C-alpha cells in the first residue's frame, strides 16, 4: 500500500536457488529487472530468480 | 456474394510516408492550407501595428517585446499561431462540457446501456443527444467542420524570405546594430523548417473519453484530463524554438534495395509537442516499440533514456532515410502501436504498414473496427491515473532540461560575440508559450443590434502570479463606444472604454498555485470575456505576466478534475449594448436581473 | 437474370446472328437447338 | 483592410 | 468478343499489380478513407479561396442597407440583421450566381452553334459512329467556343471562380446556435435572440453541397442522337430547364424548417472477407427523386424513390421506378458523402452499369460509380461512357420513364405544406415573434426570393468596365423589378446601363452611387415571356458601364410574395418558339456618347458597328 | 542507328525481382511508381491543385484592379513612338500578365543562384574537400553534404522538401486561369469610327485564347540544378561554372517560351496515346512532349520492354506534320498508332525529360514495364525524381552530359534557329492580317512591342520582408543580360504617408551608389547602363555582369521596378557556356551588404568605395 | 476593399 | 490594398 | 586520435600475402576501399588484403 505523493519502487529478491517464479497480481502491474526499462502493465510474470 | 478480390485491394491502406508522390501531395495541401488562412504578405503588413501595440503595453524593463528585431518577430509569428489554435480548441471543449451537463440524464443512459457498440458509434450517439455544433467523428467530417484558426502551423512557409547571413565585424555603431537586428541566425532557420504543430479536436478526444466512462462526470473528467496533457505539450513545443538548439526531425528508415519477402521498416517519431519519443520497428510480422525521453541526450546519441519498452528495436539499421512530420501526439501514436502489436497475427503485413503510416502522417484512424476500439482503449489508459508512463515527471524534466540549454547557449554566445548580439539571437523574454506576452486576434460572427461580439476565454492557467489583460479595438468610424463583458459564475462585469488604436487594460487577476483565481469572492478556474464593438475591423487581446518566467502550476489529472467542479453555463449569455443605460454598468449578480434580460437591471 | 426472351427459336437464332460476333454465336445456338430437340422428345416420353 | 492601412488612412483624413 | 464492354482485368478477374492495366483502374473514393479525406480538403480549399468568411461578415452591413433601400412592402422586406436571414442569403446568393453563370455560358454556346449551323449540321448528320465525347470535341472546334475540352481535367482548369459548388460546413462555421430567452419579451432580449440560428438550420448546412453542371457536360447527351442543329439546341435548353427547376427546389429545403437527409454508403463491418456487398443511398438536395443502388456480388439493383410525402418512420418515400429488389435494412458501417452529380446523372450511370454488370469486375463497377457520384468524373471506359450519355438523354427527353414535371410539382406542394406546419407548431410553442425569426416567410424559392448577384467585369472599353447580367429566363410570372448598386472610388461619377433586346437596346445614364437605382420593370406572363417594346422576349441582357468601379450589384425583386410558378419547358416547347440572342454580344462605348444617343433606338438607326452613335 | 553514349551507369535493381512482376500485398507493391497521366483520377486531382496554387498567389480580381495603375506607370515612362506599351488594349494586357509572372519566377530563381554562389565561394576550402574526398557517393548525397557545409537557406534536395521551401512568386503560371472571362471575337463590320475601335481594343482573338489554354511555365530551382552540377565537379570553380552554365540554358528557353505567344501561331499540346482497350501483356504507350520553354521536343514510345525515343526540332514545320527534323535518334518511334489521346502539361524541361529517357533506356532490361511507365510519367507530370537511387544518379549524369560542352545536341544552334523561325512567323502573320483586315486591326491583335521576355518593357513587383530601423528593404538584381544595347531602370514607390523619403542603393564589385528620390506614384529613373556584345557593362570604371539594387521605403505598400530597352528587338548575346563562365569571374559577395537610411547624413549620399568605410557601418563614411 | 470599408472611408474623407 | 485604391483614397483625402 | 578541426582519413595497408584480415573496433567506425562509397559505421569488418 502506497500512501505517498508519487509512485514508489519496490525491490524483490527471490534468491538464486529457485528455478522459476510466477507472479500474479490482483491488478495489472509493471515489473522489470534492476536498471531496466519498465514494460506495460500485465497480470502475470514468469521470471528466473537468477 | 463471394468477391473476385479486386475491391479489397482498393480499400487497402497505403504507405503514405514511403511512397514519394503521396508524401509530395500531402506537403502541398498542408502548405496551401497554411497560406490560405495565414498570408505572409498580410503578416508582414501588420508588423508595424503589432510593434506599436506591444510597446504601448508599458512593460517593465527587461520584459519588453521588441518586434523590430527579426528574431522576436519570427518567434511571435509561431507563438501567436500556436496559441490561437490551442485557444479555439479550449473554447470548443468548454462548449462541449456545457452541453453534456444540460443532458446529463440522457448521457448517463447512453453510457450505461451502450457498452457493446463501437467507440465511434457511442461518440456519434453522444453528440446527437446533445445539441453539438459538430456531430461528425469521422476524419472527413472533422476537416469540413474545422475553422480557420485550428489549421496546423507550417514551419517552412513561415521562414521564407527572411535574411539569415548578416555580418558586421568589430562594429558597435548604431547603424551596424540596426542591420544586425534585421536578420536571424542560421540555427533558427533550421528550427522552422522542421516545425509542424498538432492540435487535437474535442471530437477526436470524446472517443477515448467515452470508451469506459460510466457516468457523465467521468466523461467530463476524462475530456479535461486529456486536454490538460495536450495543452502542456504545446507549451514545450514553443519553448524548444526559444532555446538556441536545433530540434530533431522524425524519419523513417527503409532498405536501400527492398526485397519482396524480407522487407523491414523502422519509424522514429520526434514530436515537437511532447517530452517523449517513439521508435517502432516492423520486421516481418513482428512489431516492437520503445518509448524514449527527448531530454538528457548526449551529443553522441540522438535518443535519451528509454522509459517504456515493448521489445528490442535496432536503430542502427542501414538503409534510406525519409523525413516526415507527425500529425499525432506521442500518446496517440503509442496507442495504435500497442493495438497493432495485439492484432499482428490477424493482420496482413501490408495492413500493418498502411495503418501505422496513415495515422502518423494524415491523422487517419484505421478502418478496422476491432483495431479502432483497442487503440482508443489504450489511449484512455495512457492518459489516466494508472498510466504506465508518469507524464508529470517527464514533462517537468523536459522543462528543467530546456531551461539549462537556454542558459548554456546564451552564455556561449555572449563570450563569442557579446551581450548585445546574444540578446538579438536568443531572446530571454519569450520562454514558454503561456508565459510569453502574446496577442490573440479575434473573429466575430455574431452581431447584436449592430454590435459585433468578440469572445475570449480567460484561462485555464498553467502558471501562477499576476496577469493583466488588455484589448485593442480598431474601427472605421471616429468616436465610437465599445463595451467589455467579463462573465463568471456569480455575475458579470460591464466596462465602457471608448478608446481605439491603443491597448486598454480591462482586468488584473491573481492566480494561486492551484491555478484558480478569486473573482469577486468566488474561486474561478476560467472566465469568459466578450467585447462588443460597432463597425469593427480588428479586435486584439493581449495577456501579460507581471514577472518574467512565471512559475508553473502542476498539471491537473483526472482526480483533480472531479474534485472541484465549476459551472460554465453562464458563458453563453450576452448583452445588447444598444439598450444599455448608465446604471447597468458595473458588477451585477444574476439575482438582480430578470430572467433572460441580462442587459437591464430590475 | 440479365437475359432476353424470344417467342420462338427462329427469333433467337436470327437475333444472335445479327449481333456482334454473330458467326461464332450461331454455332452455339445450333447445338442448343439439337439439345432442345432431345429435350422435347425425352420429356414427352417421360413427363415429370 | 489591415490595421496599419486603416490607421494610416485615418491620419490622412484628419 | 460478344461483349462490347471489355474489362481491364480479363476473364480470370486478376490484374497484376504494377502493370499498366492496374494503374488505370478506377479507385473507390467513397470507400477509401484516405481518398475521401483528400477530396473534402481540396473542396473546402476551393470554397474558401473564392468565398471568404471574413469578407462576407464585413459586407453584411453594406448589404443590409441596400436591401432596406429597395423600399419593399411590409411582409416582403429582407432583414439581414436577423442571423437566420443572413445565413439564408449567403447560401442563396452563391447558389444563384453559379446558376446565372451557367445560363450565361449556355447562351454563348447557342449563339456559336447558330453562327456555324451549316458545319454543325454536317457533323451531326454525316458522323454517327463516333462516341458522344468525340462528337463534342468536333462541335466545340467547329464553333469557336472559349472552352474546347470535355475532359474533366480541362473543365476544372477552365471552370473559373463563381461556379465552385457551395460548401455548407464552411458557411455554418462560427454562428451561434443556442440562445434562450426564458419568457422575456423585451427589446434587449429580442435583439439577442435575433443574433442566433437554431440547431435545425445548423444541421441543414452541414449536409448541403450544390451541384452546377457546365454546358460542356450537357453537350454530350444533347448530341448523342441529335440530327440537326435545332435538335441540339432544343436538347440543350430542355436539360438546363430541368436543372434550374431542381436547383430552385434545393434552396427551398433550407427555408422550410426541417433537417434534410444525408447521402450515405453502407459497407460490411468486416473488411476483407468472401462476402462482398455495398449499398448506396443518394439523397440529392437539388432534386425531387432519390436513388438507392445495391451491389451484391456482380448483381446490381436500383430503386428510384420520391423525396416527398414521407412519414417520420421511414426516410424513403414511394418508389417511382424499380430496377430490382434493394434491401435498405442491411447492417454495417455507414459512411456519409456528398453527391456531386444530379439524380438523372446518377441514374444514367446506374442503368449503364446494370447492362454491363457481368462484363466488368466488381472493383470496376464500384470505382466507376463512386468516381462519378463523389467527383463528377466520367468513366474512362469509352463504351461505358457512351451508354451512360444515351440514358441521360432518354431520362430528359419526352419519352422519359419518369414524369419529371409531376414529381417536381409534388415536391413544391409538399415543401409549402411543411413550412406552414412548422410555422404553426413553433407559433404555439414560443410565439409569433420567435417563429418569424427562425422560419422567415419571405425567402421561399430561389428564383422567387429577392436576391443580389455580384458582378465581375474583365472587359474595359475606353476606361469603362463592363458588367454583364442576363435577365431571365423566368420560372415565375408576375411583375419584376431590377436595381443596380454601383460603388466607385470617385466622389462624382456617371455610369450607363444598357438593355439589349432582339430589335434595339435601351440606354440609361445615372449618377446615384451607393443607393440602389431601379433600371427596369417588367411584366411576365404564364409562359415565361415578357413584352419588351412590342416584341415577345424570353430573356434580356443588361450591361453596366462604370468608370473606376469597385463593386456592382444587381437586385432582383418580385412585386408579390410567393410568385406563382411557370410550367417547366420541355423539348417540344423549346423548338416551337425560337428567339435570337446574337445581339447580346454587341457593346457600346460610353466615352463616345452624346445626349441624342441615350434612349431606346432600333438597329436600323445605327450603322454597321458603331452601336453608340445613332447616325446611319 | 540509335545514339550510343559510353556513359558509365550504375547497376539498377528493380522492386519486382527476377520475374519482373511485383507480388501482391507486399511493401514493394505499395512503393511502386504508378501512372499519373493515364489515370484520370490523378490527372484531375493534380490539375485542381495546380490551379489552386495559381489563384492563391495571383488573384484575377487583384490583377484586374491593378490594370489602371499599371497602365499609368507604363505611360509615364515616356517611351518613343512605336515602343509604347498600351495596356488599354486587351491583347497587350493579357501578354503583360503572362510576361510579368514569368519574369518574376525567373528573377527569383536567378537571385537564389546568386546567393548559392556566394555561400560556396565563402566556404571554398570545405567545399573543395568534399568534392575530392567524396567522389563515389551518389549525386544526391553530394548535394546534401554541400548544402550543409554552406549555410544554405534550403538544405533539402527531396521533392517534398523543395515544395515546402518554395514560396510565392516561383509557382508555375497556370495558363487557363489567366484567360478566364476575357471577351473573344468582337466583331465590327467595316467601321473605322473611334467608338468601333474602342470596342475592338477590348477583346482578343480566338488564337490567343487557344495559346493560353495550352501554356504552363517551368522554373527549375537551384537545388534541382546542384545535383547535375556536382556529378563530375572536382573544384569549387568547376561547380560554380556548371551551375551558371545550366541556368544560362534555362533562361534562354524561358525567353523562347514567351516569344511563342507573341507570334500569331498557336502552340502545340503535349499528349499521350494509349490503346483503346488495353490488354494485359500487350500494352503500349506513346508520349509526345512539346515543351513551351524549349526549342526541341521529345517522342517516347514504350512497346513491350523496348524504349525508343526521338528528339525533333520545333521549328521549320510545314504544317503538314507536327514534327520537325530529327536531331537525335534513339530507335524507331511510330507516331501513327491508333488509340485514345490524353493531353497533359509537362513540368520539366526538354533537357530534363531527355536525361531520364536515356537513363531508362539503359535500365530497360533491369526494370519492369510498369516501373518505366511510372517513373517517366511522374517526372514529366509532377517533376518527381525516381525513388530508385541508382536510377536517379544515372539521370543526373545524363543531365550533365546534355548541358556540357560535349553534348550530342548543339543547343546554341537550335535555339538560334528557333529565334529566326519565330521572327519570320510574326512577319508572315502580321502581313497576312494587314491584308485581310486593316493595319489598325493588325496592330491590336499582333503587337510589335512584345518580342521576348528579356526584351519587352516589363515590370516586376518586389516583395519586402526585411526592415532596418523602420525602412523596408526591397531587392532587385540587375542582370545578367542576354541582349546588348542601352537599358533604363525605373522605380515606382507607393506609400501611405503624404510625404516620404525613400532611398535607392546600387551595389557593384567596388563600392555602391546611394540615391534619394522622394517622389511617389510616378516612375523615377535610377540607372542607365550600356551593355556590350559580351553582356557586360562598365559601371564606374569596372566590368560588371550584374548589379544589385536595394530600395528602402518607410511604410511601403508596393514597390515596382521597370526595365526598358531603348530600341525594340534588341540584338541578342550568344549564350554563355562552361568555358565562358570559367574564363571571367566576378565577385558577388558585396550584394549582402546593407545600409540604414535612418542613420544617413548628406555627405554619405553618392558614389563611395569600400575603402572609405570601416568594417561594417556601410551607411556612414569615415 | 469591401463595400463597407469603401463607404466608411469616403465618409471620413468628406 | 491595391495601388489603384491607395491612389484614389489619397486623392479624396487631399 | 584526431586532434584536428575535422574528420581525417587513415590509410591501412595490410600487404598482399595475408588471406583474410578481420577488423574490430572499440566503437563503430567507417571503413571502405579506395574509390568505394563509405558505408554506415559497423563494429567489425572482414577484408581481403589483395
CSV table of C-alpha atoms in Angstrom, one decimal, chain F residues 28-173:
chain,number,residue,atom,x,y,z
F,28,UNK,CA,7.3,-3.2,-52.7
F,29,UNK,CA,3.8,-3.0,-54.2
F,30,UNK,CA,3.0,0.0,-52.0
F,31,UNK,CA,6.1,1.9,-53.0
F,32,UNK,CA,5.8,1.2,-56.7
F,33,UNK,CA,5.6,4.2,-59.1
F,34,UNK,CA,2.2,4.4,-60.9
F,35,UNK,CA,0.9,6.3,-63.9
F,36,UNK,CA,-0.4,9.8,-63.4
F,37,UNK,CA,-1.3,11.0,-66.9
F,38,UNK,CA,-3.0,7.7,-67.8
F,39,UNK,CA,-5.1,7.6,-64.7
F,40,UNK,CA,-8.0,10.1,-64.8
F,41,UNK,CA,-8.4,10.4,-61.1
F,42,UNK,CA,-4.8,11.6,-60.6
F,43,UNK,CA,-4.7,13.7,-63.8
F,44,UNK,CA,-7.8,15.5,-62.5
F,45,UNK,CA,-6.6,15.9,-58.9
F,46,UNK,CA,-3.2,17.4,-59.9
F,47,UNK,CA,-4.8,20.0,-62.2
F,48,UNK,CA,-7.0,21.1,-59.4
F,49,UNK,CA,-4.1,21.6,-57.0
F,50,UNK,CA,-2.1,23.4,-59.7
F,51,UNK,CA,-5.0,25.8,-60.3
F,52,UNK,CA,-5.3,26.4,-56.5
F,53,UNK,CA,-1.7,27.5,-56.2
F,54,UNK,CA,-2.0,30.0,-59.0
F,55,UNK,CA,-5.1,31.6,-57.6
F,56,UNK,CA,-3.5,31.8,-54.1
F,57,UNK,CA,-0.6,33.9,-55.3
F,58,UNK,CA,-2.1,35.6,-58.4
F,59,UNK,CA,-5.7,36.6,-57.9
F,60,UNK,CA,-7.6,37.6,-61.0
F,61,UNK,CA,-9.6,40.2,-59.1
F,62,UNK,CA,-6.4,41.9,-57.8
F,63,UNK,CA,-4.8,41.8,-61.3
F,64,UNK,CA,-7.9,43.3,-62.9
F,65,UNK,CA,-7.9,46.1,-60.3
F,66,UNK,CA,-4.2,46.9,-60.8
F,67,UNK,CA,-4.7,47.4,-64.6
F,68,UNK,CA,-5.5,51.1,-64.2
F,69,UNK,CA,-2.4,51.8,-62.0
F,70,UNK,CA,-0.1,49.7,-64.3
F,71,UNK,CA,-1.3,51.5,-67.4
F,72,UNK,CA,-0.4,54.9,-66.0
F,73,UNK,CA,3.1,53.7,-64.9
F,74,UNK,CA,3.8,52.4,-68.4
F,75,UNK,CA,2.6,55.7,-70.0
F,76,UNK,CA,4.7,57.8,-67.6
F,77,UNK,CA,7.9,56.0,-68.8
F,78,UNK,CA,7.8,58.3,-71.9
F,79,UNK,CA,8.7,55.7,-74.4
F,80,UNK,CA,9.3,56.6,-78.1
F,81,UNK,CA,6.6,56.1,-80.7
F,82,UNK,CA,6.3,52.5,-81.7
F,83,UNK,CA,7.7,51.3,-78.4
F,84,UNK,CA,4.8,52.3,-76.1
F,85,UNK,CA,3.1,49.5,-74.0
F,86,UNK,CA,-0.6,50.4,-74.1
F,87,UNK,CA,-2.3,48.2,-71.5
F,88,UNK,CA,-5.7,49.6,-72.5
F,89,UNK,CA,-5.6,47.1,-75.4
F,90,UNK,CA,-6.8,43.6,-74.2
F,91,UNK,CA,-4.2,41.6,-76.1
F,92,UNK,CA,-1.3,43.7,-74.6
F,93,UNK,CA,-2.7,43.4,-71.1
F,94,UNK,CA,-3.0,39.6,-71.5
F,95,UNK,CA,0.6,39.3,-72.7
F,96,UNK,CA,1.8,41.5,-69.9
F,97,UNK,CA,0.2,39.3,-67.3
F,98,UNK,CA,2.0,36.3,-68.8
F,99,UNK,CA,5.2,38.2,-69.1
F,100,UNK,CA,5.2,39.7,-65.6
F,101,UNK,CA,4.5,36.4,-63.9
F,102,UNK,CA,7.1,34.5,-66.0
F,103,UNK,CA,9.8,37.2,-65.4
F,104,UNK,CA,9.2,37.3,-61.6
F,105,UNK,CA,9.8,33.5,-61.3
F,106,UNK,CA,12.9,33.7,-63.5
F,107,UNK,CA,14.2,36.6,-61.4
F,108,UNK,CA,13.7,34.8,-58.1
F,109,UNK,CA,15.4,31.7,-59.4
F,110,UNK,CA,18.4,33.8,-60.6
F,111,UNK,CA,18.5,35.6,-57.2
F,112,UNK,CA,18.8,32.3,-55.3
F,113,UNK,CA,21.5,31.0,-57.6
F,114,UNK,CA,23.5,34.2,-56.9
F,115,UNK,CA,23.3,33.7,-53.2
F,116,UNK,CA,24.2,30.0,-53.5
F,117,UNK,CA,27.4,31.1,-55.4
F,118,UNK,CA,28.3,33.4,-52.5
F,119,UNK,CA,28.0,30.6,-49.9
F,120,UNK,CA,30.1,28.2,-52.0
F,121,UNK,CA,32.8,30.8,-52.5
F,122,UNK,CA,32.9,31.7,-48.8
F,123,UNK,CA,33.4,28.1,-47.8
F,124,UNK,CA,35.7,27.2,-50.7
F,125,UNK,CA,38.2,25.2,-48.6
F,126,UNK,CA,35.5,22.9,-47.1
F,127,UNK,CA,33.7,22.6,-50.5
F,128,UNK,CA,36.9,21.6,-52.2
F,129,UNK,CA,37.5,18.9,-49.6
F,130,UNK,CA,34.0,17.4,-50.1
F,131,UNK,CA,34.4,17.3,-53.9
F,132,UNK,CA,37.7,15.5,-54.0
F,133,UNK,CA,37.2,13.2,-50.9
F,134,UNK,CA,33.7,12.0,-51.8
F,135,UNK,CA,33.6,11.0,-55.5
F,136,UNK,CA,32.0,7.6,-55.1
F,137,UNK,CA,28.8,8.7,-53.3
F,138,UNK,CA,25.6,9.5,-55.3
F,139,UNK,CA,25.0,12.9,-56.7
F,140,UNK,CA,22.0,13.5,-54.3
F,141,UNK,CA,24.2,12.6,-51.3
F,142,UNK,CA,26.9,15.0,-52.5
F,143,UNK,CA,24.3,17.8,-52.8
F,144,UNK,CA,23.1,17.2,-49.2
F,145,UNK,CA,26.6,17.4,-47.9
F,146,UNK,CA,27.4,20.6,-50.0
F,147,UNK,CA,24.2,22.3,-48.8
F,148,UNK,CA,25.1,21.5,-45.2
F,149,UNK,CA,28.7,22.9,-45.1
F,150,UNK,CA,27.4,26.1,-46.6
F,151,UNK,CA,24.7,27.8,-44.6
F,152,UNK,CA,22.1,27.4,-47.4
F,153,UNK,CA,18.5,28.6,-46.6
F,154,UNK,CA,17.1,25.5,-48.3
F,155,UNK,CA,19.1,22.4,-47.3
F,156,UNK,CA,16.7,19.8,-48.6
F,157,UNK,CA,17.1,18.1,-52.0
F,158,UNK,CA,14.0,15.9,-51.6
F,159,UNK,CA,10.9,16.7,-53.7
F,160,UNK,CA,8.7,17.2,-50.6
F,161,UNK,CA,11.4,19.5,-49.1
F,162,UNK,CA,11.7,21.5,-52.3
F,163,UNK,CA,8.0,22.1,-52.4
F,164,UNK,CA,7.9,23.4,-48.8
F,165,UNK,CA,10.9,25.6,-49.3
F,166,UNK,CA,9.5,27.2,-52.5
F,167,UNK,CA,7.5,30.4,-51.9
F,168,UNK,CA,5.0,32.5,-53.8
F,169,UNK,CA,6.5,34.0,-57.0
F,170,UNK,CA,8.1,30.8,-58.2
F,171,UNK,CA,4.8,29.0,-58.7
F,172,UNK,CA,4.2,28.0,-62.3
F,173,UNK,CA,1.9,30.1,-64.3
